[PDB]
Amino acid sequence: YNYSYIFKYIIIGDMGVGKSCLLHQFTEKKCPHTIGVEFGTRIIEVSGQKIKLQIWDTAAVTRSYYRGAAGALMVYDITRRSTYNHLSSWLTDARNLTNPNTVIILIGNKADLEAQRDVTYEEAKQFAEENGLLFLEASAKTGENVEDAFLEAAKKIYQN
Ligand SMILES: Nc1nc2c(ncn2[C@@H]2O[C@H](COP(=O)(O)OP(=O)(O)O)[C@@H](O)[C@H]2O)c(=O)[nH]1
Ligand SMILES: [Ca+2]
């Protein structure tokens, strides 16, 4: 496919929140023994425009990809409050290490584990709003809201 832009995304968050899984769900749209996908690409369509997305689970060239990041998916696990409590630390890196146009989107992953919910939708939304973040709850496992996660960022990126 004949893209016209390249948006670089980072994905960041505590270990085990589902970053690789989110990346794989988005880039393959579908192996516990594996380390887990680190990097991926996908040509999406956003406002009648074809854009190549580069997506990197980042946890020299790394610093240069950071500085050129159009978007940043900041991920927590809704079943583990500690991953939510670490969000201000990730946001500091996400802001400090990228550039002034970088669109940050908060993702509350593992939403399918509803019986294990440890963080409310509401408190997380208030954090997002306070910090000017887009915010979705998602499930990398089922695929619920995973495209929207990547596509919502991309639409806001395109407006600049
Ligand atoms: N139930 C559920 N498990 C998930 C989800 N996303 C990831 N996992 C599991 O969480 C574990 C760690 O996921 P991974 O993507 O490697 O996390 P990472 O360390 O953030 O890259 C694995 O056993 C995944 O199968 C999800 O949306 N729902
Ligand atoms: Ca990973």
Coordinates of all heavy atoms in Angstrom, one line a residue, residues 15-71, unseen atoms left out:
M15 N 5.7 -3.9 33.1 CA 5.9 -5.2 32.6 C 4.6 -6.0 32.8 O 4.0 -5.9 33.9 CB 7.0 -6.0 33.3 CG 8.4 -5.4 33.1 SD 9.6 -6.1 34.2 CE 10.3 -7.4 33.1
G16 N 4.1 -6.6 31.7 CA 3.0 -7.5 31.8 C 1.6 -6.9 31.7 O 0.6 -7.6 31.9
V17 N 1.6 -5.7 31.2 CA 0.3 -4.9 31.1 C -0.4 -5.3 29.8 O -1.6 -5.2 29.6 CB 0.5 -3.4 31.2 CG1 0.9 -3.0 32.6 CG2 1.4 -2.9 30.1
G18 N 0.4 -5.9 28.8 CA -0.1 -6.3 27.5 C 0.3 -5.4 26.3 O -0.4 -5.3 25.4
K19 N 1.5 -4.8 26.4 CA 2.0 -4.0 25.4 C 2.3 -4.7 24.1 O 1.9 -4.4 23.0 CB 3.3 -3.3 25.9 CG 3.2 -2.4 27.1 CD 4.5 -1.7 27.4 CE 5.6 -2.6 27.9 NZ 5.3 -3.2 29.2
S20 N 3.1 -5.8 24.2 CA 3.4 -6.7 23.1 C 2.1 -7.2 22.5 O 1.9 -7.3 21.3 CB 4.3 -7.8 23.5 OG 5.6 -7.4 23.7
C21 N 1.2 -7.7 23.4 CA -0.1 -8.2 23.0 C -0.9 -7.2 22.2 O -1.5 -7.5 21.2 CB -0.8 -8.7 24.2 SG -1.7 -10.2 24.0
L22 N -1.0 -5.9 22.8 CA -1.6 -4.8 22.1 C -1.1 -4.6 20.7 O -1.8 -4.4 19.7 CB -1.5 -3.6 22.9 CG -2.5 -3.4 24.0 CD1 -2.2 -2.2 24.9 CD2 -4.0 -3.3 23.5
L23 N 0.3 -4.6 20.6 CA 1.0 -4.4 19.3 C 0.7 -5.6 18.3 O 0.4 -5.3 17.1 CB 2.6 -4.4 19.6 CG 3.6 -3.8 18.6 CD1 5.0 -3.7 19.2 CD2 3.6 -4.5 17.3
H24 N 0.7 -6.8 18.8 CA 0.4 -8.0 18.0 C -1.0 -8.1 17.5 O -1.3 -8.5 16.4 CB 0.8 -9.3 18.7 CG 0.8 -10.5 17.9 ND1 -0.2 -11.3 17.7 CD2 1.9 -11.0 17.1 CE1 0.2 -12.3 16.9 NE2 1.4 -12.1 16.5
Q25 N -1.9 -7.7 18.4 CA -3.4 -7.7 18.1 C -3.6 -6.6 17.0 O -4.3 -6.9 16.0 CB -4.2 -7.3 19.3 CG -5.7 -7.1 19.1 CD -6.4 -8.2 18.4 OE1 -6.4 -9.3 19.0 NE2 -7.0 -8.0 17.3
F26 N -3.0 -5.5 17.1 CA -3.2 -4.4 16.1 C -2.6 -4.8 14.7 O -3.2 -4.7 13.7 CB -2.7 -3.1 16.6 CG -2.9 -1.9 15.7 CD1 -4.2 -1.5 15.5 CD2 -1.9 -1.3 14.9 CE1 -4.5 -0.5 14.6 CE2 -2.2 -0.3 14.1 CZ -3.5 0.1 13.9
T27 N -1.3 -5.3 14.8 CA -0.5 -5.6 13.5 C -0.8 -6.9 12.8 O -0.6 -7.1 11.6 CB 1.0 -5.5 13.8 OG1 1.3 -6.3 14.9 CG2 1.3 -4.0 14.1
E28 N -1.3 -7.9 13.6 CA -1.8 -9.2 13.0 C -3.3 -9.4 13.0 O -3.8 -10.2 12.3 CB -1.1 -10.4 13.7 CG 0.5 -10.4 13.6 CD 1.0 -11.1 12.4 OE1 0.4 -12.1 11.8 OE2 2.2 -10.7 11.9
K29 N -4.0 -8.6 13.9 CA -5.4 -8.8 14.1 C -5.8 -10.2 14.5 O -6.8 -10.8 14.0 CB -6.3 -8.3 12.9 CG -6.6 -6.8 13.0
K30 N -5.1 -10.8 15.5 CA -5.4 -12.2 16.0 C -4.6 -12.5 17.3 O -4.1 -11.6 17.9 CB -5.1 -13.2 14.9
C31 N 0.9 -18.8 21.9 CA 2.4 -18.8 22.0 C 2.8 -18.1 23.3 O 3.5 -17.1 23.3 CB 3.0 -18.0 20.8 SG 2.7 -18.7 19.2
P32 N 2.5 -18.7 24.5 CA 2.9 -18.1 25.8 C 4.4 -18.1 25.9 O 5.0 -17.3 26.6 CB 2.2 -19.0 26.8 CG 1.9 -20.3 26.1 CD 1.7 -20.0 24.7
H33 N 5.1 -19.1 25.3 CA 6.6 -19.3 25.5 C 7.4 -18.3 24.8 O 8.6 -18.3 24.9 CB 7.0 -20.7 24.9 CG 6.8 -20.9 23.4 ND1 5.6 -21.1 22.9 CD2 7.7 -20.9 22.4 CE1 5.7 -21.2 21.5 NE2 7.0 -21.1 21.2
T34 N 6.8 -17.4 24.0 CA 7.5 -16.3 23.3 C 7.8 -15.2 24.2 O 7.1 -14.9 25.2 CB 6.6 -15.9 22.0 OG1 6.6 -17.0 21.1 CG2 7.1 -14.7 21.4
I35 N 8.9 -14.4 23.8 CA 9.2 -13.2 24.5 C 8.1 -12.1 24.3 O 7.7 -11.4 25.3 CB 10.6 -12.5 24.1 CG1 11.7 -13.4 24.5 CG2 10.7 -11.2 24.8 CD1 12.9 -12.7 25.1
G36 N 7.5 -12.1 23.1 CA 6.4 -11.2 22.8 C 6.9 -10.1 21.8 O 8.0 -9.6 22.0
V37 N 6.0 -9.8 20.8 CA 6.4 -8.9 19.7 C 6.9 -7.6 20.3 O 6.3 -7.0 21.2 CB 5.3 -8.8 18.7 CG1 4.1 -8.1 19.2 CG2 5.8 -8.2 17.4
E38 N 7.9 -7.1 19.7 CA 8.6 -5.8 20.2 C 8.3 -4.7 19.3 O 8.1 -3.6 19.8 CB 10.1 -6.1 20.3 CG 10.9 -4.9 19.9 CD 12.4 -5.0 20.3 OE1 12.8 -6.1 20.7 OE2 13.2 -4.0 20.1
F39 N 8.2 -5.0 18.0 CA 8.0 -3.9 17.0 C 7.0 -4.4 15.9 O 6.9 -5.6 15.7 CB 9.4 -3.6 16.4 CG 9.4 -2.5 15.4 CD1 9.4 -1.2 15.9 CD2 9.4 -2.7 14.1 CE1 9.4 -0.1 15.0 CE2 9.4 -1.7 13.1 CZ 9.4 -0.4 13.6
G40 N 6.4 -3.5 15.3 CA 5.4 -3.8 14.2 C 5.1 -2.6 13.4 O 5.3 -1.4 13.8
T41 N 4.5 -2.8 12.2 CA 4.0 -1.8 11.3 C 2.6 -2.2 10.8 O 2.3 -3.3 10.7 CB 5.0 -1.5 10.1 OG1 5.0 -2.6 9.2 CG2 6.5 -1.2 10.6
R42 N 1.9 -1.1 10.4 CA 0.6 -1.3 9.7 C 0.2 0.0 9.0 O 0.3 1.1 9.5 CB -0.4 -1.7 10.8 CG -1.8 -1.9 10.2 CD -2.7 -2.6 11.1 NE -4.1 -2.3 10.8 CZ -5.2 -2.8 11.6 NH1 -4.9 -3.4 12.7 NH2 -6.4 -2.5 11.2
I43 N -0.2 -0.2 7.7 CA -0.8 0.9 6.9 C -2.2 1.0 7.2 O -3.1 0.2 6.9 CB -0.7 0.6 5.4 CG1 0.8 0.6 5.0 CG2 -1.3 1.8 4.6 CD1 1.5 1.9 5.2
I44 N -2.6 2.1 7.9 CA -4.0 2.5 8.2 C -4.5 3.6 7.3 O -3.7 4.2 6.6 CB -4.1 2.9 9.7 CG1 -3.3 4.1 10.0 CG2 -3.7 1.7 10.6 CD1 -3.7 4.7 11.3
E45 N -5.8 3.8 7.2 CA -6.4 5.0 6.5 C -7.1 5.9 7.5 O -7.9 5.5 8.3 CB -7.4 4.5 5.5 CG -7.7 5.6 4.4 CD -8.5 5.1 3.3 OE1 -9.3 4.2 3.5 OE2 -8.4 5.6 2.2
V46 N -6.6 7.2 7.5 CA -7.1 8.2 8.5 C -7.4 9.5 7.7 O -6.4 10.1 7.2 CB -6.0 8.5 9.5
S47 N -8.6 9.8 7.6 CA -9.1 11.0 6.9 C -8.8 11.0 5.4 O -8.2 12.0 4.9 CB -8.6 12.3 7.6 OG -8.7 12.1 9.0
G48 N -9.1 9.9 4.7 CA -8.8 9.8 3.3 C -7.3 9.8 3.0 O -6.9 10.2 2.0
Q49 N -6.5 9.4 4.0 CA -5.0 9.4 3.9 C -4.5 8.1 4.3 O -4.9 7.6 5.3 CB -4.4 10.6 4.7 CG -4.8 11.9 4.2 CD -3.9 12.4 3.0 OE1 -3.7 11.6 2.0 NE2 -3.4 13.6 3.0
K50 N -3.5 7.6 3.6 CA -2.8 6.4 4.0 C -1.5 6.7 4.8 O -0.7 7.5 4.3 CB -2.5 5.5 2.7 CG -3.8 5.2 1.9 CD -4.0 3.7 1.7 CE -4.4 3.0 3.1 NZ -4.4 1.5 3.0
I51 N -1.4 6.2 6.0 CA -0.3 6.4 6.9 C 0.3 5.1 7.3 O -0.4 4.2 7.7 CB -0.8 7.1 8.2 CG1 -1.6 8.4 7.8 CG2 0.3 7.4 9.1 CD1 -2.6 8.8 8.9
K52 N 1.6 5.0 7.2 CA 2.3 3.9 7.8 C 2.6 4.1 9.2 O 3.2 5.2 9.6 CB 3.7 3.6 7.1 CG 4.4 2.3 7.5 CD 5.6 2.0 6.7 CE 6.3 0.7 7.1
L53 N 2.1 3.2 10.1 CA 2.4 3.3 11.5 C 3.5 2.4 11.9 O 3.6 1.3 11.5 CB 1.2 2.9 12.3 CG 0.1 3.9 12.7 CD1 -0.5 4.5 11.5 CD2 -0.9 3.2 13.6
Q54 N 4.5 3.0 12.6 CA 5.6 2.2 13.2 C 5.3 2.1 14.7 O 5.1 3.2 15.3 CB 6.9 2.8 12.9 CG 7.4 2.5 11.4 CD 8.6 3.3 11.1 OE1 9.0 4.2 11.8 NE2 9.1 3.0 9.9
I55 N 5.3 0.9 15.3 CA 4.9 0.8 16.6 C 6.0 0.0 17.4 O 6.4 -1.1 17.0 CB 3.6 0.0 16.7 CG1 2.6 0.6 15.7 CG2 3.1 0.1 18.2 CD1 1.5 -0.4 15.2
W56 N 6.5 0.5 18.5 CA 7.7 0.0 19.2 C 7.5 -0.1 20.7 O 7.3 0.8 21.4 CB 8.9 0.8 18.8 CG 10.2 0.1 19.0 CD1 10.4 -1.2 19.4 CD2 11.5 0.7 18.8 NE1 11.8 -1.4 19.5 CE2 12.5 -0.3 19.2 CE3 12.0 1.9 18.4 CZ2 13.9 -0.1 19.1 CZ3 13.4 2.2 18.4 CH2 14.3 1.1 18.7
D57 N 7.5 -1.4 21.2 CA 7.5 -1.7 22.6 C 9.0 -1.5 23.0 O 9.8 -2.4 22.9 CB 7.0 -3.1 22.8 CG 7.1 -3.6 24.3 OD1 7.5 -2.8 25.2 OD2 6.8 -4.8 24.5
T58 N 9.3 -0.3 23.6 CA 10.7 0.1 23.7 C 11.4 -0.5 24.9 O 12.6 -0.4 25.0 CB 10.8 1.7 23.7 OG1 9.8 2.2 24.5 CG2 10.7 2.2 22.3
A59 N 10.6 -1.0 25.9 CA 11.2 -1.6 27.1 C 11.7 -3.0 27.0 O 11.7 -3.5 25.9 CB 10.1 -1.5 28.3
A60 N 20.5 5.8 21.6 CA 21.1 6.3 20.3 C 20.0 6.3 19.2 O 19.4 7.4 18.9 CB 22.3 5.4 19.9
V61 N 19.7 5.1 18.6 CA 18.6 5.0 17.6 C 17.3 5.0 18.4 O 16.2 5.5 17.9 CB 18.7 3.8 16.8 CG1 17.5 3.7 15.8 CG2 20.0 3.7 16.0
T62 N 17.3 4.5 19.6 CA 16.1 4.5 20.4 C 15.7 5.9 20.8 O 14.6 6.3 20.8 CB 16.3 3.7 21.7 OG1 16.7 2.4 21.4 CG2 15.0 3.7 22.6
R63 N 16.7 6.7 21.2 CA 16.5 8.1 21.6 C 16.0 8.9 20.4 O 15.1 9.8 20.5 CB 17.8 8.7 22.2 CG 18.3 8.0 23.5
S64 N 16.5 8.6 19.2 CA 16.0 9.3 18.0 C 14.6 9.0 17.5 O 14.0 9.8 16.8 CB 17.0 9.0 16.8 OG 16.5 9.5 15.6
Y65 N 14.2 7.7 17.8 CA 12.8 7.3 17.6 C 11.9 7.9 18.6 O 10.7 8.3 18.2 CB 12.7 5.8 17.7 CG 11.4 5.1 17.4 CD1 11.3 4.4 16.2 CD2 10.3 5.2 18.2 CE1 10.1 3.7 15.8 CE2 9.1 4.5 17.9 CZ 9.0 3.8 16.7 OH 7.8 3.2 16.3
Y66 N 12.3 8.1 19.8 CA 11.6 8.8 20.8 C 11.3 10.2 20.4 O 10.2 10.6 20.3 CB 12.4 8.7 22.1 CG 11.9 7.7 23.1 CD1 12.2 6.4 22.9 CD2 11.1 8.1 24.2 CE1 11.7 5.4 23.8 CE2 10.6 7.1 25.1 CZ 10.9 5.8 24.9 OH 10.4 4.8 25.7
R67 N 12.4 10.9 20.0 CA 12.3 12.3 19.6 C 11.4 12.5 18.4 O 10.9 13.7 18.3 CB 13.7 12.9 19.4 CG 14.6 12.9 20.6 CD 13.9 13.6 21.8 NE 14.8 13.9 22.9 CZ 14.4 14.4 24.1 NH1 13.1 14.6 24.3 NH2 15.2 14.7 25.0
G68 N 11.2 11.5 17.6 CA 10.3 11.6 16.4 C 8.9 10.9 16.6 O 8.1 10.8 15.6
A69 N 8.6 10.4 17.8 CA 7.3 9.8 18.1 C 6.2 10.8 17.9 O 6.2 11.9 18.5 CB 7.3 9.3 19.5
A70 N 5.3 10.4 17.0 CA 4.0 11.2 16.8 C 3.0 10.9 17.9 O 2.2 11.7 18.3 CB 3.4 10.9 15.4
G71 N 3.1 9.6 18.4 CA 2.2 9.1 19.4 C 2.8 8.2 20.4 O 3.8 7.6 20.2

